[model samples]
Every structure is written in structure tokens, then in C-alpha cells.
Target: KDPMVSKGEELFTGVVPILVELDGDVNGHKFSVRGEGEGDATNGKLTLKFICTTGKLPVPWPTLVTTLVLCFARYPDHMKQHDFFKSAMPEGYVQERTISFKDDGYYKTRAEVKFEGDTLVNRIELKGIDFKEDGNILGHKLEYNFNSHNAYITADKQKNGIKSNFKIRHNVEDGSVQLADHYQQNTPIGDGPVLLPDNHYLSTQSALSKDPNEKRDHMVLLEFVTAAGITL
Candidate 1:
């Protein structure tokens, strides 16, 4: 399954309520949530909570334990955005590069959501890049190792697969040292040390026309707001 379902859900929970509560009418209809991990494992039980710009309460946030959520389709175009982490290039970075990746198959996701009636348990496994690539089977082989720790002291190390800084060097002798792209973040979705160029303008054009067919590789991002547990 595409990482979008979970990541979309994560991304959704991360920003939606904040945006809605903070921006309010300013961000109304800026985007919409679609596809709620449909499968035998997912259904009305997978509470997907959301709050509209109008401050209306919705369902509950779906986790791994209570529901078995899986990506049903790609998110609509308006919801997807170019991530600066994967779309920025440094000066004089290589145009194209390739490395080996562990093949885990199309559904590279290996999520394990464990919960016991609302008390959070353990959340494990890896994630795939939101962007689509030709061959990246293992969930881990889809992002660049920017050595986030070396750059930002405050970068959340707990955040799996998220980089805070650049630690790759260009090994001139063999393709070991990772070359830098002024747009290093703009590399294609892959697993190794290679950041290539992709035409966002053109890619967007193609993506916009594409429809959310059932089996196509896709990810969806949606926001949900629900009543928060009061601490007072």
C-alpha cells in the first residue's frame, strides 16, 4: 500500500486542526480530504476525525490498533504539495544518479498500530516518499539521508525517516559520496545516494490529468477535527 494513507493521515492530523483553528475562514476549502483507507480492515470503525473551517467536529483519528487502515487511492492533486525537503537542490549537484534499494514490493508499507481503547501503545515500521518512483520496494529506500542530526540540533530524531541536515559527501572515485544538489531535496523518489532533477511544472501537468484509479500508486492527505480530551 502507498504510504499516503498513513502519512496522509499523519500529515492531516499534524496540520489540519492547527490550520483550521489558526487560519479559520482564511483557509476555507483550501483543500479537502478524500479516501479513508478502504479495505476489509477499514470501514466506519476507522474513526477519521476532522474539523472544517467552520469549527464543526467530525470522527475520531484512526490508528493502527482500532482499525487496519490502508491506502485505497492517491490523494487529489490540490492536496499534494512539493515537499521542500525533497525538492530543494544545492549548487552544482548531479543531474541524475542511481543506487541499490532493498525490494519490498509495491506495498512497501509495514505499519503496526497498537492501541487499547484510546491509550496509545506502540507505532512501528517505516514510510515511503509521498512522490512516486519507478522501483523502491522497501519502505526505507525512498528518502535521502541528509544527516539531519548534524545540521539542526532541534531536529526531532524520534521522527522516523525525517532528516534535519546534510551529511552526504560526493565521493569522486566511486559513486559512494552523495553529490549535492542545490536542489538536493528535488531528487527522484528512491532509496540511495542520488538526487536527480525532475520537472515539477511538467510533472504537475501529468499528475493533474491522472485520475485516482483503484490500483494506481497513490497517497491521500486529509484533515479531521474532533473533541479533544480535556485536561483541566
Candidate 2:
């Protein structure tokens, strides 16, 4: 009974869609989780949006909240709805769940979540022990690989010395036929993809028309090319 420290309760709004993956040492960070909670007991309040590319150019909020809590512990129904998940099985917690978090105390962390039914096999472990902040010592370890359809996180962080050992995967690039071939060839003088079908284009600021007693600055780049095909 932990809906943010339980009281009288009325918490369960739904909408949990976290597209995880935050590899190592602040590099492969890709998290896209939107709010709303529930599902393996309840601890909702998720909202961590990030796309990636952190080779260091103004990126270091405790390495983005320690790589978003290591991709939110690889989701086992939101890490069994975290309120500090615990229960590596004292004959309790269904599949497996264990959690920890430390920030005000400075980066101390721990995690272990596993699932087989809803599929997240291959076990898991997200640790960040002596992890320091303005104090240094940033030891780390994360390795999870949820059965493809995109799900991979591999991090070593070389004890926080960080030297290229981060790998997160799951954007898988495939923008819906490149966004319908870019809405059928967003023309700038024609190219390949667009065939034809009620295609219309005309917006020179919506064919401009504002007259506060007209005081034109300048306007006249009109081009009407031929057999009824071009007009601007």
C-alpha cells in the first residue's frame, strides 16, 4: 500500500509508456517515459524525457540522474511499482524486484528486477555504489537486454573514468515511410517520392492580406507558371 506513502488512496490513472534504454557513463541515454501509474502494485509518477547524445557538451546532471535511474530499472511493471521495490523473494514478490535510490545522500543506488512472463528475461542488475557527485568516485554497472523489439543497455563507465563504453538501443529509425515520403514530396521544385492525389500547396503567409489602412513594405514575387499548374 504505497501510492506515494499511502494514506486514504485514489491513485491509479493509467498511461505508462516508457521507451527505455540508457547504457553507460552518461552516453547512451535514451529515455521517453510519460506519466501516469499502476500495474504491478502501484508507484506511478513517471516523467523522464530524453533522447540521447551525451558525449559531454553541457550534459551532466549527475549524469542525467544517473542515466535515468538506469533506465528505471529495466521495467518489470515499472519495477514492481517502486516505493523501493524490495523482495528478492522471501516467498513474496512474484517475479523479482529490488530497488534503491540516493541523491541527497549523493548518488548511491541499487536495482535488480526480473521478469519472464511479460518478457524481460535474462535477469537484470543496476548498481551504482560508491557513486559520487561533486565528490568524485563514480563506480557503476548496468547490463540489461530485454528480448528485442528494441531493448538494450550496456554500461561499464570504467569506474566513472568513462572512455566510450555506453550502448543503449531503441529509436530504431523508421519514420513511417519516412513520414509518408515526407507528405508526398514536400516540393521545392520536385524530386522523387510524390505521385499525385489532391495535392495542394499555397501559403505565402496565406496569400497575405492585412490592411490597417495599408502601408506596404514590399510584396511581389509572384510566379504563375503555365497550363494551370503554378501560382503564388
Candidate 3:
């Protein structure tokens, strides 16, 4: 009877179950969810706030309704407090928060590097400036290795683009820490795998603020400098 809710099989108890939780608000407006061609015109509006799952997993959009139909086939008698998370954090949970640019913007970022024995500890600090619009504009990669360097998503931007010491070398270069995105057409930086004994940091930016009250034009983000050939 509660098979869908307890779909976990005997062999693969830990990883067999796949679950999703969807929530929405509908008005005048009735709330109804059925398979395929199922809907009521009287239902005024529908506002979907979020879709959550057990793990950071990606589900196909097309199969969403099917998944919903299967998971929600629960009887009142079978309902019980169970683990959304089996290992420790019992049951399932999800939460959301909103970030507005003006509330907390990326003002200035600073980087300071030091030696931890043989390892490099790069300390980075972000100063919340302020922006008219809030968004996630920075794409980067800074994994530490000894053999060579890989271009970040902006790797193509770094190829023959030149490297520098400026916090955000945007004035002279793309101001990026090359982290390869691993795609076609967009090849690796010519100086791909930047020869060791190399030193540089990457840069990211936001659209110029249009607010008349604010002074600064645009926002800039920089990555920490951590690699060989450091004379810091």
C-alpha cells in the first residue's frame, strides 16, 4: 500500500530511493495535480516557489509529473515520520533566502598569500560595496596543483590575453584565474597549463551600476593568488 513511499528495495536500501518535493500556490483557484491532460479552468493562478530533492540531484523536466504522480500516491494511514535523509539528518529539508544587490554587493576584493610550510595559504577578503542589481556573475576555478595550470571557464579569455599582478587586471587583461570549462570550440589558453613558476590571479565583473546616488560604476571580483613562482 505504501510501496511508493517505501520503494527502497532490500538489495540497495541506501541509494535506491529517489524523491522530490514540489510546492506551489494556486488561487480562486483550486489546487489540483493530475496526469497528462488534467486541469481546471476555474483555477485562477499558479505560483511555483521551489522544487527540492533528497540530494543535490538534477531531475529531468519531462518526467517531473510522472515522478510527482508516483511519489504522492500515499494513503493517510501509511504516513509516518521517516528519513528524507537516512544517514544522520533525518527526514527531508529545504530552505530558501533571497539576496538583493543593494542589500549586499561585492565592493572590493583583496588577496594576501603566505607560506604554510610547503603549502600555500591564500587568504581572500570581500568588501560588500553595493549594486543596483544582484546576480551571480563570477565563474571561476582555483584548485592547487604542482605540474601545470588549467584555464578556468574564462580560460579561453586568458589564452594569449596576458597575465598580471593587478588585483583585477581587467584594465590590461580579462583579469581571470584560468579554470578550464572543458568544452569544444573554446580551446585552452595558448599558454595552457601555464608553466609552473608562474604567478597570477583572475578577475570577474558585474554590470555598471545605473543608480544615480552610487559613485562606483561597476563591480569586480578577484581570485586568490596561489601557485609556484610566488615572490609574495
Candidate 4:
């Protein structure tokens, strides 16, 4: 039997809340993010809690986590700001304009931003970037790599023998962005290095030798949260 229920076509059709925890370090400062929500759009809502850095030094965890959640929750809105969803205005296509992203309480984080010579700049500087995930085949599979700038999700069922992948990327410096429903053609199969669980860092970590030479780079400790009840 298939382990996951697939994204859109599920054996079960009801909605269940899922709490996601993304933990990692940014520029040596540790950070943790918690996001709670489900697939339902009407009654469903997402709540996030984030903390980064322990000492007096500045840590960008709050901003980072907020952007991350907002992207997942409302990226289509952000995409409309850009002409073609490009991060910055294309060169020589000058109209001397400015765009704003104010999502009220949904995007609690704030910053002053403007375009400078075609490159988008955030008035509030970002220290660095860091990025985690998991789970059963109930609905969706959360796939992420600490080294990667984005996380990916694949539906449980294939569309025309092609599974779609959702790419989510976020940070204070670049803001939150996503590329959804891509890789619909020529999807790979059978324990590929790109697949999750099979290729997940933690899974591979256990398979490697314990020698110091085999030590890998730092990775974020991520957790997948889900609710057993019908509602969150």
C-alpha cells in the first residue's frame, strides 16, 4: 500500500492541523520556529512562534520565521507584487515605482524596503540565512535539506505519472518566495538522491561510519507536528 495519501487525492478528505518545527542556526546563532495549521482555508489558521540567539547578540530568527510562514500561507499575494514574480525589477524596464507588502496581522513582522538601481534592498539588514522537515504519507511529505535554500513537498498521487513539487524559500534578506506545482514532467523514481527520507540528512547520517572523517556539515533539527483530532 502507498505510505502517503497524496496531496489532493486522499483516502481521507477531512482536514487535520499540522504543527511544523524548523530549527537551525543562522550565522552561528541558533533559531527555532513553530508553525501550526492545516490545509483548510476557511476555519484554518496558522500560528507561529520563533526564538533565535541566547545571548545579547542580535539574531534574525523572528523575521526569518515570520517570512517563512507568510510565504506558505500567502505567497500568491506576494507574487503579484512583482511583474513576473522576479525578486527585483528587471533592468531598463524602469518606471520608477515602489511596491509594498502589508498583510496586516498575518505578516506581523515589519521592515522598510525600497528598490535601489533595480536591486531590491531591505532597510533592516539581515545577518544571515538558515533553513528543516518529515512525516507520514497521510497527506503531504515535507522534504528539506539544511544546506538547501528551500524546502520541497510532493503530492501523494501522480498527475499524468508526474508528481508536482512545491519549492519554498524564505529569509529576511530576500523575503519569502515559492515555486509551486513544478517538475510535473520526467519525475524520477526509485531511491533517488533527491527523494526525502531515503535522501534525508538524518537518514543518511545514521548510515554513515562514525569516523571523524565522515562527519558532515551542520544541519537543522526539524520536527513535524500533526494533530490527531479533527480540529486544531
**Maximum-lDDT candidate:** 4
lDDT (Cα, tens digit) per residue for candidate 2, span 2-26: 5563121121223223333333322
Query: Which pairs of residues have clashing backbones in candidate 2?
Result: none
Residue 82 CA displacement from its true place in model 3, Å: 61
Q: Is candidate 2 or candidate 3 better by TM-score?
A: 3
Worst 10 residues of 4 by lDDT: 199-208
The global C-alpha lDDT for each of the candidates, from Candidate 1 onward, is 0.21, 0.22, 0.20, 0.24
lDDT (tens digit, per residue) of candidate 1 on 168-198: 2222223343323211111222332222212
Clashing pairs in 4: 4-137, 6-156, 7-156, 19-225
* Tens digits of lDDT, candidate 3, 71-151: 111112122111111111111111111112222233332322222232222222232223222222221121111112222
The 10-residue segment of model 3 with minimum total lDDT is 83-92
The number of the candidate with the highest TM-score is 4
- lDDT order of candidates, top first: 4, 2, 1, 3
Error of 1 at 17 (Å): 17
Q: Against the true structure, what is each candidate's TM-score?
A: 0.16, 0.17, 0.18, 0.25
| lDDT string, candidate 4, 115-168, tens digits | 233222222222232221111111122222222222232222242111223332
**On a 0 to 100 scale, what is the lDDT of residue 211 in model 4?**
26
